[PDB]
Coordinates of N, CA, C and O and ligand atoms in Angstrom, one line a residue:
Chain A
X214 N 133.6 168.7 159.0 CA 132.4 168.5 159.7 C 131.2 168.6 158.8 O 131.2 169.4 157.9
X215 N 130.3 167.7 159.0 CA 129.1 167.6 158.1 C 127.9 167.2 158.9 O 128.0 166.4 159.8
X216 N 126.8 167.9 158.6 CA 125.5 167.5 159.2 C 124.5 167.3 158.1 O 124.4 168.0 157.2
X217 N 123.8 166.2 158.2 CA 122.8 165.7 157.2 C 121.5 165.5 157.9 O 121.4 164.8 158.9
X218 N 120.4 166.1 157.3 CA 119.1 166.0 157.8 C 118.2 165.2 156.7 O 118.0 165.8 155.6
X219 N 117.7 164.1 157.1 CA 116.9 163.3 156.2 C 115.5 163.3 156.6 O 115.2 163.4 157.8
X220 N 114.6 163.1 155.6 CA 113.1 163.0 155.9 C 112.6 162.0 154.8 O 112.8 162.2 153.6
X221 N 111.9 161.0 155.3 CA 111.4 160.0 154.4 C 109.9 159.8 154.5 O 109.2 160.4 155.4
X222 N 109.3 159.0 153.6 CA 107.9 158.7 153.6 C 107.8 157.3 152.9 O 108.6 157.0 152.0
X223 N 106.8 156.6 153.2 CA 106.6 155.3 152.6 C 105.1 155.0 152.5 O 104.3 155.4 153.4
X224 N 104.7 154.2 151.5 CA 103.3 153.7 151.4 C 103.4 152.3 150.9 O 104.1 152.0 149.9
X225 N 102.6 151.4 151.6 CA 102.6 150.0 151.2 C 101.2 149.5 151.2 O 100.3 149.9 152.0
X226 N 100.8 148.6 150.3 CA 99.5 148.0 150.2 C 99.8 146.5 149.9 O 100.4 146.2 148.8
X227 N 99.3 145.6 150.7 CA 99.4 144.2 150.5 C 98.1 143.5 150.2 O 97.0 144.2 150.3
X228 N 98.1 142.3 149.8 CA 96.9 141.5 149.5 C 97.2 140.0 149.5 O 97.9 139.5 148.7
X229 N 96.6 139.4 150.5 CA 96.9 138.0 150.8 C 95.6 137.2 150.5 O 94.5 137.7 150.5
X230 N 95.8 135.9 150.2 CA 94.6 135.0 150.0 C 95.0 133.6 150.3 O 96.2 133.2 150.1
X231 N 94.1 132.8 150.8 CA 94.3 131.3 151.0 C 93.8 130.6 149.9 O 92.6 130.9 149.4
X232 N 94.5 129.6 149.4 CA 94.0 129.0 148.2 C 93.2 127.7 148.4 O 92.9 127.0 147.4
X233 N 92.9 127.4 149.6 CA 92.0 126.3 149.9 C 90.6 126.8 150.4 O 89.6 126.0 150.3
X234 N 90.6 128.0 150.8 CA 89.4 128.6 151.3 C 89.2 130.0 150.8 O 89.0 131.0 151.5
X235 N 89.4 130.2 149.5 CA 89.5 131.5 148.8 C 88.2 132.3 148.9 O 88.3 133.5 148.9
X236 N 87.0 131.6 149.0 CA 85.8 132.4 149.0 C 84.8 131.6 149.8 O 85.0 130.5 150.3
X237 N 83.6 132.2 150.0 CA 82.5 131.6 150.7 C 81.2 131.8 149.9 O 81.1 132.8 149.2
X238 N 80.4 130.8 149.9 CA 79.2 130.7 149.1 C 77.9 130.9 149.9 O 77.8 130.4 151.0
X239 N 77.0 131.7 149.4 CA 75.7 131.9 150.0 C 74.6 131.8 148.9 O 74.6 132.5 148.0
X240 N 73.8 130.8 149.1 CA 72.7 130.5 148.2 C 71.3 130.9 148.8 O 71.1 130.7 150.0
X241 N 70.5 131.6 148.0 CA 69.2 132.0 148.4 C 68.2 131.0 147.8 O 68.0 131.0 146.6
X242 N 67.5 130.2 148.7 CA 66.7 129.1 148.2 C 65.2 129.3 148.6 O 64.9 130.2 149.3
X243 N 64.4 128.4 148.1 CA 63.0 128.4 148.5 C 62.4 127.1 148.3 O 62.7 126.4 147.3
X244 N 61.5 126.6 149.2 CA 61.0 125.3 149.2 C 59.6 125.3 148.5 O 58.8 126.2 148.7
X245 N 59.3 124.2 147.8 CA 58.0 124.1 147.1 C 57.4 122.8 147.5 O 58.1 121.8 147.5
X246 N 56.1 122.8 147.7 CA 55.3 121.5 147.9 C 54.3 121.4 146.9 O 53.4 122.2 146.7
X247 N 54.3 120.2 146.1 CA 53.4 120.0 145.1 C 52.6 118.7 145.3 O 52.0 118.1 144.4
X248 N 52.5 118.2 146.5 CA 51.8 117.0 146.9 C 50.5 117.2 147.5 O 49.9 118.3 147.5
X249 N 50.0 116.2 148.2 CA 48.7 116.2 148.8 C 48.7 116.4 150.3 O 47.7 116.6 150.9
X250 N 49.9 116.3 150.9 CA 50.0 116.4 152.4 C 51.0 117.5 152.8 O 51.9 117.8 152.0
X251 N 50.8 118.2 153.9 CA 51.7 119.1 154.4 C 52.9 118.4 155.0 O 52.8 117.2 155.4
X252 N 54.1 119.1 155.1 CA 55.3 118.6 155.7 C 55.7 119.5 156.8 O 56.0 120.7 156.5
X253 N 55.8 119.0 158.0 CA 56.3 119.7 159.1 C 57.8 119.5 159.3 O 58.3 118.4 159.1
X254 N 58.5 120.6 159.7 CA 59.9 120.5 159.9 C 60.7 120.1 158.7 O 61.4 119.1 158.7
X255 N 60.5 120.8 157.6 CA 61.1 120.5 156.3 C 62.6 120.6 156.4 O 63.1 121.6 156.9
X256 N 63.3 119.6 156.0 CA 64.8 119.5 156.1 C 65.4 119.0 154.8 O 65.6 117.8 154.7
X257 N 65.6 119.8 153.9 CA 66.2 119.4 152.6 C 67.7 119.2 152.6 O 68.4 119.9 153.4
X258 N 68.2 118.3 151.8 CA 69.6 118.1 151.5 C 69.9 118.4 150.1 O 69.2 117.8 149.2
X259 N 70.8 119.3 149.8 CA 71.0 119.8 148.5 C 72.5 119.6 148.1 O 73.4 119.5 148.9
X260 N 72.7 119.6 146.8 CA 74.0 119.5 146.2 C 74.3 120.9 145.5 O 73.5 121.4 144.8
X261 N 75.5 121.4 145.7 CA 76.0 122.6 145.0 C 77.0 122.2 144.0 O 78.2 121.9 144.4
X262 N 76.6 122.1 142.8 CA 77.5 121.6 141.7 C 78.0 122.7 140.8 O 77.3 123.6 140.4
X263 N 79.3 122.7 140.6 CA 80.0 123.7 139.8 C 80.8 122.9 138.7 O 81.9 122.5 139.0
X264 N 80.3 122.8 137.5 CA 81.1 122.3 136.4 C 81.5 120.9 136.6 O 82.7 120.6 136.5
Chain B
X1196 N 62.2 77.4 164.8 CA 62.7 78.7 164.7 C 61.6 79.6 164.2 O 61.0 79.3 163.2
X1197 N 61.4 80.8 164.7 CA 60.5 81.8 164.2 C 61.0 82.6 163.1 O 60.3 83.1 162.2
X1198 N 62.3 82.8 163.1 CA 63.0 83.5 162.0 C 64.0 82.5 161.4 O 65.1 82.4 161.8
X1199 N 63.5 81.8 160.3 CA 64.3 80.7 159.7 C 65.5 81.3 159.0 O 66.6 80.8 159.2
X1200 N 65.4 82.4 158.3 CA 66.5 83.0 157.6 C 67.4 83.9 158.4 O 68.5 84.2 158.0
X1201 N 66.9 84.2 159.7 CA 67.8 85.0 160.5 C 67.6 86.5 160.5 O 68.5 87.2 160.9
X1202 N 66.5 87.0 159.9 CA 66.3 88.4 159.7 C 65.2 88.9 160.7 O 64.7 88.1 161.5
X1203 N 65.0 90.2 160.8 CA 64.1 90.7 161.8 C 62.6 90.3 161.7 O 61.8 90.6 162.5
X1204 N 62.3 89.6 160.6 CA 60.9 89.3 160.3 C 60.7 87.8 160.5 O 61.5 87.0 160.0
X1205 N 59.6 87.4 161.1 CA 59.3 86.0 161.4 C 58.9 85.3 160.1 O 58.9 85.9 159.0
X1206 N 58.7 84.0 160.2 CA 58.2 83.2 159.1 C 56.8 83.7 158.6 O 56.6 83.8 157.4
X1207 N 55.9 83.9 159.5 CA 54.6 84.3 159.2 C 54.6 85.7 158.6 O 54.0 86.0 157.5
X1208 N 55.3 86.7 159.2 CA 55.4 88.0 158.7 C 55.9 88.0 157.2 O 55.4 88.8 156.4
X1209 N 56.9 87.2 156.9 CA 57.4 87.2 155.6 C 56.5 86.5 154.6 O 56.1 87.1 153.6
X1210 N 56.0 85.3 154.9 CA 55.2 84.5 154.0 C 53.9 85.2 153.8 O 53.3 85.3 152.7
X1211 N 53.3 85.9 154.8 CA 52.0 86.5 154.7 C 52.1 87.9 154.0 O 51.1 88.5 153.7
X1212 N 53.4 88.4 153.8 CA 53.5 89.7 153.1 C 53.2 90.9 154.0 O 53.2 92.0 153.5
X1213 N 53.1 90.7 155.3 CA 52.7 91.8 156.2 C 54.0 92.4 156.7 O 54.2 92.6 157.9
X1214 N 54.9 92.8 155.8 CA 56.1 93.5 156.1 C 56.2 94.8 155.3 O 55.3 95.1 154.6
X1215 N 57.3 95.5 155.4 CA 57.6 96.6 154.6 C 57.4 96.3 153.1 O 57.9 95.3 152.6
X1216 N 56.6 97.1 152.4 CA 56.2 96.8 151.0 C 57.3 97.2 150.0 O 57.1 96.9 148.8
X1217 N 58.4 97.8 150.4 CA 59.6 98.0 149.6 C 60.5 96.8 149.4 O 61.4 96.9 148.6
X1218 N 60.3 95.8 150.3 CA 61.1 94.6 150.2 C 60.8 93.8 149.0 O 59.6 93.7 148.6
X1219 N 61.8 93.3 148.3 CA 61.6 92.5 147.1 C 60.7 91.3 147.4 O 60.8 90.8 148.6
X1220 N 60.0 90.8 146.4 CA 59.2 89.6 146.7 C 60.0 88.4 146.7 O 59.4 87.3 147.1
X1221 N 61.3 88.4 146.4 CA 62.2 87.3 146.7 C 62.2 87.0 148.1 O 62.0 85.8 148.5
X1222 N 62.3 88.0 149.0 CA 62.4 87.9 150.4 C 61.1 87.6 151.1 O 61.1 87.6 152.3
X1223 N 60.0 87.3 150.4 CA 58.8 86.8 151.0 C 58.9 85.3 151.3 O 57.9 84.8 151.9
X1224 N 59.9 84.6 150.8 CA 60.1 83.2 151.1 C 60.8 83.1 152.5 O 61.8 83.8 152.7
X1225 N 60.3 82.3 153.4 CA 61.0 82.2 154.7 C 62.5 81.8 154.6 O 63.2 82.0 155.6
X1226 N 62.9 81.3 153.5 CA 64.3 80.9 153.3 C 65.2 82.0 152.8 O 66.4 82.0 153.2
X1227 N 64.7 82.9 151.9 CA 65.5 84.0 151.4 C 65.4 85.1 152.5 O 64.4 85.6 152.8
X1228 N 66.6 85.5 153.0 CA 66.7 86.5 154.0 C 66.5 87.9 153.4 O 67.0 88.2 152.3
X1229 N 65.6 88.7 154.0 CA 65.5 90.1 153.7 C 66.8 90.8 154.1 O 67.0 90.9 155.3
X1230 N 67.6 91.2 153.2 CA 68.9 91.6 153.5 C 69.5 92.6 152.5 O 69.6 92.3 151.4
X1231 N 69.8 93.8 153.0 CA 70.4 94.8 152.1 C 71.9 94.7 152.0 O 72.6 94.5 153.0
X1232 N 72.4 94.9 150.8 CA 73.8 94.9 150.5 C 74.2 96.2 149.9 O 74.0 96.4 148.7
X1233 N 74.7 97.1 150.7 CA 75.0 98.5 150.3 C 76.5 98.7 150.1 O 77.3 98.2 150.9
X1234 N 76.9 99.3 149.0 CA 78.2 99.6 148.8 C 78.3 101.1 148.3 O 77.4 101.7 147.9
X1235 N 79.6 101.6 148.3 CA 79.9 102.9 147.9 C 80.9 102.9 146.8 O 81.7 102.1 146.7
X1236 N 80.7 103.9 145.9 CA 81.7 104.0 144.8 C 82.1 105.5 144.6 O 81.2 106.3 144.4
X1237 N 83.4 105.7 144.5 CA 83.9 107.1 144.3 C 83.8 107.4 142.8 O 84.1 106.6 142.0
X1238 N 83.5 108.6 142.5 CA 83.3 109.1 141.1 C 84.3 110.1 140.7 O 84.8 110.0 139.5
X1239 N 84.6 111.1 141.5 CA 85.8 111.9 141.2 C 86.3 112.5 142.6 O 85.6 112.4 143.6
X1240 N 87.5 113.0 142.6 CA 88.1 113.5 143.8 C 88.7 114.9 143.5 O 89.4 115.1 142.5
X1241 N 88.5 115.8 144.4 CA 89.0 117.2 144.3 C 90.1 117.5 145.4 O 89.9 117.0 146.5
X1242 N 91.1 118.2 145.0 CA 92.2 118.6 145.9 C 92.2 120.1 146.1 O 92.3 120.8 145.1
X1243 N 92.1 120.6 147.3 CA 92.2 122.0 147.6 C 93.5 122.3 148.3 O 93.6 122.2 149.6
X1244 N 94.5 122.7 147.6 CA 95.8 123.0 148.1 C 95.8 124.3 148.9 O 95.7 125.4 148.3
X1245 N 95.9 124.2 150.2 CA 95.8 125.4 151.1 C 97.2 125.9 151.4 O 97.7 125.8 152.5
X1246 N 97.7 126.7 150.4 CA 98.9 127.5 150.6 C 98.4 129.0 150.6 O 97.4 129.3 150.1
Ligands
CA373 CA1 58.9 78.7 162.2

C-alpha cells in the first residue's frame, strides 16, 4: 500500500503580436500661415513617409 | 451650336477668354475642347503580412 501527496506550482508569461498592425503612429503637428489671407476650416492632407 | 467643341464653355466664353484662367490657351479656340486627361501611375507597393 502506498500514499503519495503531490504539490505543484507554475508560472507562465506569453507575448503575442500581429505583424500587419504591429504598432500605431501618433504625430504632433502644427499649422502655419505665411500668406495674406486667413483660412477658415483648415483641412490639411499629409504624407507620413518612412524610408 | 453654342458649344462647338462639346465642352461646358460656349464659343464666346472660350474665344473671349472669360473662363477659368488655369486652362491652357490652346483651349481658347472654339475648336479645341477644354478637356482634362488624367491618369494614375503606381510607384511602389508594400505588403503587410498579417500573421
Ligand atoms: Ca456658335
